[PDB]
């Protein structure tokens, strides 16, 4: 007895627990489609409107759940449309399987219609990249691709000649290795290295703990170390929410998608504990130029001493190590450094609240995000696009350990807001999901609003319409000699786009319109997707990387101009608080 | 004295006559943007909403004019979004320059934000693919890229570290080699090979001339050879219009994007003259299995004998060679083969007119295309997307040598209708331009309807809304065991999408609505873009590759079913006409 | 009726006129081997000892005859050993087909022994690079590969799963397109452009004609234009021999593999006619910085204005264009520029002759090459390795249009001497063939001396043993601040290496030993290969790019030292001759 090789392939996906997958059919992938069609009760095919959205959504599946995302594209242009999502998966180091259609083996290398050597297309993006040439081994090739994508935390691509999945293979021969999958049991953290790290951290005058998403399991330990030891916390932007934003000694993130207290404290710190962190600005921004001792905890040998010369680098799990530090320390009294940082945070949060709390007038991004906070459930998931929204969401969203947020962290491809929200709702139908996107990024993937409608995925889409590539406009202001170019453009009314895909929607341009529109959207999203198009000003958000508040550092004229432009008259530089507490 | 290297780069583009270029800015390409900004009077930057549209439009520029198209993308995701247009340019062998942003040289290889080794990304698509590393040589690298793209008829990609274009270089050193550019003067066509080819063609009983776009300069000679010698003409789909469609011995194209008379005649022909033709279905469809002698004229040695064993292959220009054949032949009387083919064409065109000429009822693609014909100017340009529209446009558009039509011929990427129309209008502001697209393809690039609005490009967009990937649905009907999957989807109202980008638009779903809506669109398009969303039936167009009309070939039951489904009761098989004239 | 797919593939090779091919067998290519075995009366397999030599020989085949060269390698390491020869073919733009073994389709992607995805290995080097996946289409894929390698003048690679050539396919379906082959059309010169070019050339005060191997069919026209118009000639190194070296207005080549008169004249010229030339040093050496007008003739649009901005560019065949120039000019009187160059060339040739004509004492490269000239037939072929030998052979070999010489022109892979000579003797059994190689380069491919013995290929191998990478030592002298490193090494006695592979050989270290050894070698090579291991001094050849002879440019002390080191006491700078005829050292 026999099975179609394509049926076996789908049974390999099922064995690995793949719930849903994305793509667009074509003749060159119609034999995989045929196998999917017979298996609708167990694996859910999501037909997207552009293959990039399928690839992005597959990456987001893995970001959210840790479970391999799966997408496909038809030969030639279907597969090449996957690229921005495949590169997102590579750079955000999440497991994705991509299946690429190909001409049957009898026509390959004949220069026939939309027939090319597809293997070189995927060689750079992929950890594993093969053209299948045999039906009987095709289940194994798919199984190998999955196992490698997991092991290597990246993209596996298989090009499949369309004849192979329609061939019969022996039913009893193929298997999946999902049953062997497991996670490692690790030794405890290296005892003598962690005692020595702890002493250096505690001997510091101006310590900081600076964590990334490698510390995602360690929020409790981070907050209790901070509180016990009187050591402020700062994070990478993606690590926002691992410790609740409300924690009074959470400084935020550094650089540009950043918060003032974090930049200022980092410049003064004498010892940094760098935990589960691969901050890509470390060298180029000279972040640690002032730092006396640099301590690291990371799971990956490839990261040890990577971002700065490191005094002690412990190769270990973040949680296990932070718990072992906590077990060997006890209460320290409040210090001037602690108090200064607490005061600086309070001043900064008062500034952000002042922006949020306006009640009437021309709409700014700040109030839109307040309105999101007001309708957000405590375990909401945020799919965030790329641009000023990362900066503004990082400052204004009030996250806790119960939330999740995702974006394209390092490749930073625009357009991910829509697909990330699709993936979030497919994985978590009972959780509230937002897509927060700028107009530029929403434009790029707008057609897949129709996918939210088609699959009845009740996403709350919020488009920030400034008629600009605002993040880039600000860059041009900073660097370019000549006039702005390519950064200001003509309006798109996304409420009308939504109507065109048969999604309920609203457009607002005044602060006073927000509460009722957001309450209506909250309610619609109990059953159907909704879109709010928020027409916002072109005001530049405060640049945390170019602060002009300290009269020892900047001219009075520069400070007065900065305070005026950024509504920052009541912000004080960290040096004010350092002086206040005697530093 | 010095010049900024970026300014010199723009002066190289200007020297080569580049009128317009496409892309989206980013920090990693802001120094090229800065140079563009100072040169708005001479080179016109078109800000697109998705970089794929810029790449597609650059390819279309070259398809239309023969002059290198230029696009750019920012580091990482900007550039990877170009791919579908770059592969279109490679496969349609037209010259395109792509500029890719990159991190400055001081941060390359530091694993910083959106910083990667970009060179491997482009290695497969590109004829020339380099990362610039020096400012003083950067003008030369761009000049080299252009000269190679032209010489090699393909894609040149340059990755540009953002620091380089802001560096000063000596003003007097750089140059462009546009002044050296020229086209070759060729020998005349090989005398003895062309006399011998001519004899074999004339000795045939059932000759055909089968040309592609390499014969684009030879329409007059093709038609006069056909008329003088009594030899029917057939073409590749892209070669439609080189000879007017109204010519009574034009059979159409073969395979699927095809016309019945061409498929039927090709199966009977004893001698084929294959001219300027690289038909990719030749081998896989066994097109020439019956052919006794196969004669070829091509300019490219790589094509000689490529598609079939060739009796005589002349390496020469198509026009020069066809004129030399014409100069050595004279009138032949009408033959039975000629008469049979003329009768078959007349029968086929009566069938297509019967579809077009319905006046009321549920709208089909056939009447939409009649309505296009009725408002089309004699020199209109058609940008055609990918799907059933290629099949239907090929049958119904009434083209002449004065028209142009473009699509993604061989890569066949969906989404090209919008960008191709943008490029057409930018090159030919005084010519009428259509974008004919299916709903699937229009969806993929829909956001760049806003670019037509922004640049006041008066395209007539016609969307064929069947709520299907119809071309693929029909494939699944033919091959798939299990139920249709991924090929039927939820409506998008493109009149509402158009309203959202501030474009006038109409939606129609009945035949009787067409005349007034098309007349309004014709008039609007004297000054602004317009969109018609044509809601059409799901009727399958007649499959020219699966004819069931000949009672010696097919069962009576199969013929009756085919005639019913395709409204083909009055079509006769070619054998009827062959018999009528005694063959 | 059926044929094995492998048999059909070999038939495709035969239809395309392939006489011989190179490689080393392995399990992963044994089905092609089986087909070759059956066809050994009609196509000839040459088993090499390292696959790089097969690839290099295939490239050399194409360089010599214009016929596609064919090589193969087994899966994994057999194929990756081809690389240096494949990049040689790419960079020297000659057609080569490379067949790469692969695991059968039933074990591909199983991570079995020697089994990998081979397609990405070849993506950069190859114009065409495919893995075959079907037996019935395999003959076409090979046919396509050959046709594109020719049309695109580069490398085509096909990875062949070993099961496919053992499958039966229909006998009647496959074909080769060899019957349809043609070479690219030769474009013709625009009449008015050629007249304007001519007018500019003839208005020049200090003209030069500077040709490369694109002018290989135009030697008669080049030499007659030079004589009629009184315009000196210079060439790229590879273009040596297109015009006989004897011609008194042949200046040589520029840069380093160069002759003094060419460098000096190029620095003074006001108009250059750059014909069939892609000189890779143009920009980096600032060759044309002071050239007033630059006139170019090339058949490739990718080259026009590449190396300097053109004043007139002609997209046409060199010999047609040069003939059209010649047809519209008449004899001109001598000029001061002409006579200054003629005198400079005599002075230079007298210097080279002085080095060649020593009769006793420590052996130098110069006398070895004189001894080669003394036994060389007028239609000899030279396969030249990479290093100082390019420099010395360029100066001393006395070539004419009847000769051929080849090296790795642009990739410049060492080791090509031995495989190029193998190829030469296979293609030209009745012509004398030399392999001129340094010790470093000969070392790299030494084992394939055995191939010359095995196939009875009577090459005259001459190894220049300095116990150095001399060309690189001289670079370190010029740039490096610290002591020499990696450039001086232990001796290898290549006469003993030759004995080990069963080749007759000689070792010499004194000038007076040369005549008798070279006569013996000439006679041995009527029937069998031979090797001469010439133990030469570590003297640096005169650096034509760093002349120290003109007291207007250089210190007396530096001139003194130059003359002493290079035995150059009798050399004059070009300015001496310019001044004699009334011209300024511009
Ligand atoms: C438009 C845009 C702008 C941005 N600019 C900023 C910015 O200004 N500031 C900013 O902070 N970010 C910014 N980013 C994000 C930035 O590019 C990086 O992605 C981010 O700073 C790196 O975060 P990370 O170190 O948490 O994650 P990763 O880079 O994923 O690193 C995780 C680290 O944790 C380690 N690890 C994993 N598991 C464990 C474990 N169990 N125990 C220990 N170690 C472990 C890994 O080995 C790795 O070193 C921006 C993003 C966007 C979209
Ligand atoms: C959805 C879709 C389906 C399609 N299916 C069909 C189909 O069923 N039928 C069909 O016909 N097409 C079809 N096509 C197009 C098809 O893929 C090929 O692109 C087309 O058939 C090849 O046309 P061509 O030979 O004219 O062009 P090219 O492939 O561009 O070849 C041009 C040839 O002309 C030669 N040449 C160039 N200049 C000269 C000169 N001056 N003199 C002499 N020779 C010269 C070239 O060397 C080359 O061989 C389809 C397209 C799409 C989008
Ligand atoms: C160790 C070493 C050092 C070297 N250093 C030197 C050096 O110092 N000096 C030196 O001169 N060389 C040197 N070379 C060689 C050098 O690298 C180049 O290969 C050589 O200078 C280029 O020669 P070319 O232009 O003749 O050949 P190619 O680069 O092959 O160019 C031939 C040109 O002719 C054109 N063409 C072809 N056919 C025609 C036709 N029918 N009509 C018109 N145009 C045609 C082509 O399009 C092309 O532009 C060295 C080689 C080695 C091994
Ligand atoms: C244009 C752009 C950006 C503008 C985004 O404009 P938006 O309108 O979406 O957002 P806003 O800033 O106006 O609120 S940010 C981005 C950087 C971070 O890389 N780039 C570059 C960019 C360009 N193209 C793609 C596909 N992805 C990218 N990241
Ligand atoms: C889905 C699809 C097609 C459906 C196009 O649907 P449309 O709705 O645009 O057109 P219609 O047929 O319904 O009128 S045709 C195409 C083939 C020719 O390649 N494919 C495959 C395809 C898939 N993805 C991209 C980007 N380009 C492609 N060509
Ligand atoms: C080492 C060396 C050279 C030394 C050759 O030493 P030889 O001993 O062969 O020659 P000689 O100069 O001593 O007479 S020349 C060459 C340059 C031109 O590229 N290189 C670099 C080189 C290094 N490795 C290989 C395979 N090929 C090369 N060309
Ligand atoms: Mg915006
Ligand atoms: Mg459709
Ligand atoms: Mg040596």
Closest CA to A266 of A284, A249, A287, A285: A287
Closest partner residue to C133 among A108, A129, A137, by Cβ?
A108
Which is the catalytic residue, given B274, B288, B464, B471? B471
* Per-domain residue ranges of chain C: 1-184, 185-351, 352-541
Which is the catalytic residue, given B472, B476, B545, B581? B472
CA of B343 to the centre of ligand 4 (A): 59
* CA distances from residue A177 to A18, A94, A174, B98 in whole angstroms, order as listed: 14, 19, 10, 44
Chains that touch C (3 or more CB pairs under 8 A): A, B
Element (H, E) at B269: none
CB C282 within 8 A of CB C288: yes
Strand bridging mode B293-298 / B312-315: parallel
Chain A residues within 8 Å of chain C (Cβ atoms): 105-111, 117, 119-120, 123, 129-134, 136-137, 140-141, 144, 161
Q: Going by CATH, does the domain composed of C185-351 fall within 3.40.50.1220?
A: yes
In the A/B pair of chains, how many CB contacts fall below 8 A? 252
CB C118 within 8 A of CB C126: no
Closest partner residue to A110 among C108, C117, C140, by Cβ?
C140
Residue B313 and residue C151: Cβ atoms within 8 Å?
Answer: no
C547: phi then psi, degrees, rounded to nearest 5:
-65, 140
Question: Can you list the positions of beta strands (E) in B38-110?
Answer: 44-47, 69-73, 96-102
CB A399 within 8 A of CB A405: yes
Q: Residue A330's CB: how many other CB atoms inside 10 A? A: 7
Token pair 């167009």: residue: B541
Closest CA to C221 of C122, C117, C324: C324
Token pair 């770059």: residue: B86
Residue of A62, A193, A214 to mutate, ligand 1, most atoms within 8 A of C-beta:
A214
Q: Do domains C185-351 and C352-541 have the same CATH topology?
A: yes
- C interface test, pick of B127, B183, B185 with most C CB neighbours within 10 Å: B185
CA of C466 to the centre of ligand 9 (A): 5
Alpha-carbon distance of A289 to A283, in angstroms, equals 9
Token pair 């960290």: residue: A574
Query: What's the token pair of residue B421?
Result: 């129309």
* CA distances from residue C35 to A265, C45, C146, C217 in whole angstroms, order as listed: 75, 11, 19, 39
CA of A529 to the centre of ligand 8 (A): 24
Q: What is the CA radius of gyration of chain B?
A: 26
Closest partner residue to A497 among B280, B408, B500, by Cβ?
B500
CB A434 within 8 A of CB A383: yes
Q: Least CA distance to A455: which residue of chain B?
A: B490
Q: Going by CATH, does the domain composed of A1-184 fall within 3.40.50.970?
A: yes
Helix residue ranges per DSSP H, B480-573: 494-500, 514-524, 556-565
Residue C137 and residue A161: Cβ atoms within 8 Å?
Answer: no
Closest partner residue to B302 among C152, C190, C301, by Cβ?
C152
DSSP letter string, A164-182: GGGSEEETTT----GGG--
Closest-approaching ligand to the CA atom of B319: 2
Which residues have CB under 8 Å from C284's CB, separation 6+?
none
With a Cβ cut-off of 6 Å, ligand 1 is lined by A 212-214, 236-239, 253-258, 276-280, 297-300, 303, 317-318, 386, 390, 407-410, 412; B 113
Q: How far apart are the first and last CA of chain A?
A: 81
Alpha-carbon distance of B149 to B153, in angstroms, equals 5
Query: What's the token pair of residue A219?
Result: 């929020």
The residues facing C273 across adjacent strands are C209, C295
Q: Least CA distance to C141: which residue of chain B?
A: B306
Strand bridging mode B2-4 / B168-170: antiparallel
Task: Please list the active-site residues of C.
Answer: 51, 113-114, 256, 386, 471-472, 475
Q: Residue A192's CB: how many other CB atoms inside 10 A? A: 7
Q: Residue C526's CB: how many other CB atoms inside 10 A? A: 8
The residue whose CA is least distant from atom 7 of ligand 1 is A257
Residue A500 and residue B490: Cβ atoms within 8 Å?
Answer: no
Closest CA to C420 of C126, C22, C45, C154: C22
Cα angle: A244, vertex A250, A254; to 5 degrees: 115
Burial of C146 (0-12, 13-18, 19+ CB in 10 A): buried
Alpha-carbon distance of C37 to A430, in angstroms, equals 70
Q: Residue B332's CB: how many other CB atoms inside 10 A? A: 12
CB C216 within 8 A of CB C299: no
Element (H, E) at A192: helix A191-203
Crossing angle of the two packed helices A336-356 and A260-268, in degrees rounded to 10: 160
3-class secondary structure, A268: helix
Closest CA to C422 of C57, C43, C49: C57
Sheet containing C128-131: order of strands: C44-47, C20-23, C69-73, C96-102, C155-161, C128-131
- B interface test, pick of C302, C315, C319 with most B CB neighbours within 10 Å: C302
Question: Can you list the positions of beta strands (E) in B268-353?
Answer: 271-275, 293-298, 312-315
A313: phi then psi, degrees, rounded to nearest 5:
-120, 115
- Whether residue B256 has its Cβ less than 6 Å from ligand 2: yes
Which residues have CB under 8 Å from C197's CB, separation 6+?
C273, C295, C297, C312, C314, C325
In the residue annotation, A386 being an active-site residue is answered as yes
d(CA A227, nearest CA chain B) in Å? 32
Alpha-carbon distance of B238 to C120, in angstroms, equals 33
Residue C179 and residue B310: Cβ atoms within 8 Å?
Answer: yes
A522-545 burial by CB neighbour count: b if 16+ within 10 A, else e? Answer: bebbeeebbbbbbbbeebebbbbe
Helix residue ranges per DSSP H, C455-532: 470-479, 494-500, 514-524
Query: What's the token pair of residue B377?
Result: 């100017």
Closest CA to B332 of B232, B231, B199, B229: B229
d(CA C143, nearest CA chain A) in Å? 11
Alpha-carbon distance of B510 to B363, in angstroms, equals 5
Crossing angle of the two packed helices C260-268 and C336-356, in degrees rounded to 10: 160
CB C425 within 8 A of CB C399: no
- Structure's resolution in angstroms: 1.1
Residue of B384, B469, B475, B487 to mutate, ligand 5, most atoms within 8 A of C-beta:
B469
Alpha-carbon distance of B248 to B341, in angstroms, equals 9
Element (H, E) at A156: strand A155-161
CB B445 within 8 A of CB B52: yes
Which is the catalytic residue, given B90, B148, B256, B370? B256
CB A440 within 8 A of CB A390: no
DSSP letter string, B506-528: EEE-BGGGHHHHHHHHHHHTTTS
Which residues have CB under 8 Å from C66's CB, separation 6+?
none
- Whether residue B417 has its Cβ less than 6 Å from ligand 4: no
Alpha-carbon distance of A476 to C288, in angstroms, equals 40
d(CA A203, nearest CA chain B) in Å? 31
- A interface test, pick of B25, B166, B457 with most A CB neighbours within 10 Å: B25
The residue whose CA is least distant from atom 26 of ligand 3 is C212
Q: Which fold, B352-541?
A: Rossmann fold (3.40.50)
Token pair 């009138």: residue: B331
Alpha-carbon distance of B406 to B241, in angstroms, equals 11
Sheet containing B207-211: order of strands: B233-235, B207-211, B271-275, B293-298, B312-315
3-class secondary structure, C437: strand
Alpha-carbon distance of C465 to C456, in angstroms, equals 25
Closest CA to C130 of C139, C142, C112: C142
Ion ligand 7, residue ranges at CB < 5 A = A 438-440, 466, 468, 470
CA of B89 to the centre of ligand 4 (A): 26
Alpha-carbon distance of B274 to B267, in angstroms, equals 15
Q: Least CA distance to B496: which residue of chain A?
A: A500
Alpha-carbon distance of B186 to B300, in angstroms, equals 13
In the residue annotation, A432 being an active-site residue is answered as no
Query: What's the token pair of residue C353?
Result: 């002759």
Alpha-carbon distance of B343 to B251, in angstroms, equals 11
Ion ligand 9, residue ranges at CB < 5 A = C 438-440, 466, 468, 470
Strand bridging mode C404-406 / C433-438: unpaired
- A interface test, pick of B485, B496, B501, B531 with most A CB neighbours within 10 Å: B485
C-alpha atoms less than 13 angstroms from C-alpha of A379 in its C-beta half-sphere: 7
Q: How far apart are the first and last CA of chain B?
A: 81
Experimental method: X-ray
CB B23 within 8 A of CB B44: no
Measured on CA atoms in the order C240, C242, C248, C254, is the torsion positive or negative? negative
Alpha-carbon distance of A298 to A274, in angstroms, equals 8
d(CA C307, nearest CA chain B) in Å? 10
CB B265 within 8 A of CB B341: yes
Residue A161 and residue C105: Cβ atoms within 8 Å?
Answer: no
DSSP state of A38: T
């Amino acid at each position: 007895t026999n099975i179609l090789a394509g049926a076996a392939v789908i049974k390999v996906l099922e064995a690995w627990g793949v719930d849903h997958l994305y793509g667009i059919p074509g003749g060159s992938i119609n034999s995989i489609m045929d196998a999917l069609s017979a298996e609708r009760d167990r694996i859910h095919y999501i037909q997207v409107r552009h293959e990039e959205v399928g690839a992005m959504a597959a990456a987001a599946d893995a970001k959210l759940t840790g479970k391999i995302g799966v997408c496909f594209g038809s030969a030639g242009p279907g597969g090449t449309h996957l690229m921005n999502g495949l590169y997102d998966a590579r750079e955000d180091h999440v497991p994705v399987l991509a299946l690429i259609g190909q001409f049957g083996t009898t026509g390959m290398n004949m220069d026939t219609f939309q027939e090319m050597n597809e293997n070189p297309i995927y060689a750079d993006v992929a950890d594993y990249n093969v053209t299948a040439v045999n039906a009987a081994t095709l289940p194994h090739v798919i199984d190998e691709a999955i196992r490698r994508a997991y092991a290597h935390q990246g993209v596996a691509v298989v090009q499949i000649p369309v004849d192979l999945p329609w061939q019969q293979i022996p039913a009893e021969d193929w298997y999946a290795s999902a049953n062997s999958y497991q996670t490692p049991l690790l030794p405890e953290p290296d005892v003598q290295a962690v005692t020595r790290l702890t002493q250096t951290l505690l001997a510091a005058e101006r310590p900081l703990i600076y964590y990334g998403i490698g510390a995602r399991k360690a929020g409790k330990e981070l907050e209790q170390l901070s509180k016990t030891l009187k050591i402020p916390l700062m994070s990478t932007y993606p690590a926002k929410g691992i410790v609740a934003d409300r924690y009074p000694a959470y400084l935020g993130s550094a650089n540009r998608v950043a918060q003032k207290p974090a930049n200022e404290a980092l410049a003064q710190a004498d010892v940094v504990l760098f935990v589960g962190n691969n901050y890509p600005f470390a060298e180029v921004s000279k972040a640690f130029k002032n730092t006396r001792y640099f301590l690291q905890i990371d799971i990956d040998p490839a990261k040890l001493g990577k971002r700065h010369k490191t005094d002690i680098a412990v190769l270990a799990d973040a949680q296990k190590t932070l718990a072992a530090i906590l077990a060997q320390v006890s209460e320290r009294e409040s210090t001037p450094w602690w108090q200064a940082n607490l005061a600086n945070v309070k001043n900064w949060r008062a500034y952000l609240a002042s922006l949020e709390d306006k009640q009437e007038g021309p709409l700014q991004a700040y109030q839109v995000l307040r309105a999101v906070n007001k309708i957000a459930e405590p375990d909401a998931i945020y799919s965030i696009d790329v641009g000023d929204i990362n900066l503004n969401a990082n400052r204004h969203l009030k996250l806790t350990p119960s939330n999740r947020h995702i974006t394209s962290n390092l490749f930073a491809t625009m357009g991910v807001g829509i697909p990330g929200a699709i993936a979030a709702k497919l994985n978590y139908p009972e959780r509230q999901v937002f897509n927060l996107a700028g107009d530029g990024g929403a434009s790029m993937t707008m057609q897949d609003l129709a996918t939210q409608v088609q699959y009845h995925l009740p996403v709350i889409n919020v488009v920030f319409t400034n008629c600009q590539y605002g993040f880039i406009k600000d860059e041009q202001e900073d660097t370019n000699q000549n006039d702005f170019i390519g950064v200001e453009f003509n309006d798109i009314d996304f409420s009308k786009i939504a109507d065109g895909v048969h999604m309920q929607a609203f457009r607002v341009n005044k602060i006073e319109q927000l509460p009722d529109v957001f309450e209506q959207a909250k309610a619609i999203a109990q059953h159907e997707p909704v879109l709010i198009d928020a027409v916002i000003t072109g005001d530049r958000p405060l640049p945390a990387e170019k602060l002009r508040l300290d009269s020892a550092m900047s001219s009075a004229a520069d400070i007065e101009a900065f305070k005026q432009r950024y509504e920052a008259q009541d912000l004080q530089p960290l040096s004010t608080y350092l002086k206040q507490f005697g530093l």
